[PDB]
C-alpha cells in the first residue's frame, strides 16, 4: 500500500523493505514454520490468482498518467 | 518370630510400591514424550494443508 501511496520512484524503497521483509521471514524461520515468502509475497500481490500483480498494475498507471508526461530525458547522464 | 515376618512382608510391600512408582514415573514420561513428537506432526501436517491450498488456489481459474 505504501508503495501505491507513492510514486514510481519509490521502488527502491519498496525492494528494501521487500528484503527486509524477507530477512526477518528468514531469521523467524529458524524456530517457527511460516510459508516461503514467494507464497506471502505473491498473497499479498495478488498474483497468485492473477496473471498480474498490484505491483505491476500500479507501475503501469504510473507509467500511463504521471511518469511519460512529467520527466524530460537527458542522454549525455541516462 | 513374629517381627522377623512383618520385615519380609515389609521388604515385599516395599518392592512392590516400588515397581508401582517406576511404572506411574514411566507412564507420566510417555505422555510427556508422545505429546511433543503430535505436536510436531500436527504443525507439519497443518503447514502442508496450507500449502496445497495455496497450490489450488494457484492453478486454478475461479
Same mark, same amino acid.
Given at each position: 500500500?505504501?508503495?501505491?501511496?507513492?510514486?514510481?520512484?519509490?521502488?527502491?524503497?519498496?525492494?528494501?523493505? /521487500?528484503?527486509?521483509?524477507?530477512?526477518?521471514?528468514?531469521? /523467524?524461520?529458524? !524456530?517457527?514454520?511460516?510459508?516461503?515468502?514467494?507464497?506471502?509475497?505473491?498473497? =499479498?500481490?495478488?498474483?497468485?490468482?492473477?496473471? !498480474?500483480?498490484?505491483?505491476?498494475?500500479?507501475?503501469?498507471?504510473?507509467?500511463?498518467?504521471?511518469?511519460?508526461?512529467?520527466?524530460?530525458?537527458?542522454?549525455?547522464?541516462? | 518370630?513374629?517381627?522377623?515376618?512383618?520385615? =519380609?512382608?515389609?521388604? !515385599?510391600?516395599?518392592?512392590?510400591?516400588?515397581?508401582?512408582?517406576?511404572?506411574?514415573?514411566? /507412564?507420566?514420561?510417555?505422555?510427556?514424550?508422545?505429546?511433543?513428537? /503430535?505436536?510436531?506432526?500436527?504443525?507439519?501436517?497443518?503447514?502442508?494443508?496450507?500449502?496445497?491450498?495455496?497450490?489450488?488456489?494457484?492453478?486454478?481459474?475461479?
Amino acid at each position: 500500500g505504501r508503495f501505491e501511496s507513492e510514486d514510481l520512484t519509490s521502488i527502491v524503497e519498496l525492494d528494501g523493505l /521487500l528484503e527486509i521483509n524477507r530477512m526477518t521471514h528468514k531469521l /523467524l524461520s529458524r !524456530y517457527l514454520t511460516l510459508d516461503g515468502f514467494d507464497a506471502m509475497f505473491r498473497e =499479498a500481490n495478488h498474483n497468485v490468482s492473477a496473471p !498480474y500483480g498490484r505491483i505491476t498494475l500500479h507501475v503501469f498507471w504510473e507509467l500511463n498518467y504521471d511518469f511519460l508526461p512529467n520527466y524530460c530525458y537527458n542522454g549525455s547522464t541516462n | 518370630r513374629e517381627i522377623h515376618q512383618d520385615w =519380609a512382608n515389609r521388604e !515385599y510391600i516395599e518392592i512392590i510400591t516400588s515397581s508401582i512408582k517406576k511404572i506411574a514415573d514411566f /507412564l507420566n514420561s510417555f505422555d510427556m514424550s508422545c505429546r511433543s513428537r /503430535l505436536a510436531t506432526l500436527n504443525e507439519k501436517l497443518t503447514a502442508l494443508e496450507r500449502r496445497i491450498e495455496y497450490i489450488e488456489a494457484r492453478v486454478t481459474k475461479g
